[PDB]
């Protein structure tokens, strides 16, 4: 989508595996705050957008 | 003085893949490897 017309997306019930994600070509960076890249495999969430 | 090349991992030092974190006391001297240790890529 474009910046002005960005598409809304919600992730439903999922058993998430992040260790296969960080070495995919579009998911190299994790430059942010409030979550930890080595801790997302042990956390639980209400929903993910 | 250590001698390693990472991908870019540049936000950190992935790299549980061989434990040298930010709160380790030290200085980081770093530059791009694409000018000397490289090819077309």
3-class state of residue A48 by DSSP: strand
Chain B residues within an 8 Å CB radius of A35: none
Long-range contacts of A37-46 (CB under 8 A, 24+ apart): A38/B16, A40/A16, A41/A16, A41/A17
Q: Which residue has the tokens 């390693």?
A: B4
Q: Which method, experimentally, gave rise to this model?
A: cryo-EM
Q: Which residue of B has its CA nearest to A28?
A: B9
- Please answer whether residues A19 and A27 qualify as being in contact, where contact means their C-beta atoms are separated by less than 8 angstroms: no
How many Å apart are CA B29 and CA B40, to the nearest integer? Answer: 25
Q: Which one, of A32, A20, B4, lies nearest residue B13 by Cα? A: B4
Q: Does A22 touch chain B (CB under 8 A)?
A: yes
CA distance B11 to chain A (A): 7
Cβ partners under 8 Å of residue A32, min gap 6? none
Residues β-bridged to residue A11: A48
How many Å apart are CA A19 and CA A24, to the nearest integer? Answer: 10
């Amino acid at each position: 989508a474009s910046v002005y017309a960005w598409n809304r997306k919600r992730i439903s019930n999922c058993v998430a595996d992040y260790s296969v994600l960080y070495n995919l070509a579009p998911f190299f960076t994790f430059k942010c705050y409030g979550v930890s890249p080595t801790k997302l495999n042990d956390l639980c969430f209400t929903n993910v957008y | 003085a250590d001698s390693f090349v990472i991908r870019g991992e540049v936000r950190q030092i992935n790299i549980d893949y061989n434990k040298l974190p930010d709160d380790f006391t030290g200085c980081v001297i770093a530059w791009n490897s694409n000018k000397l240790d490289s090819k077309v890529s």
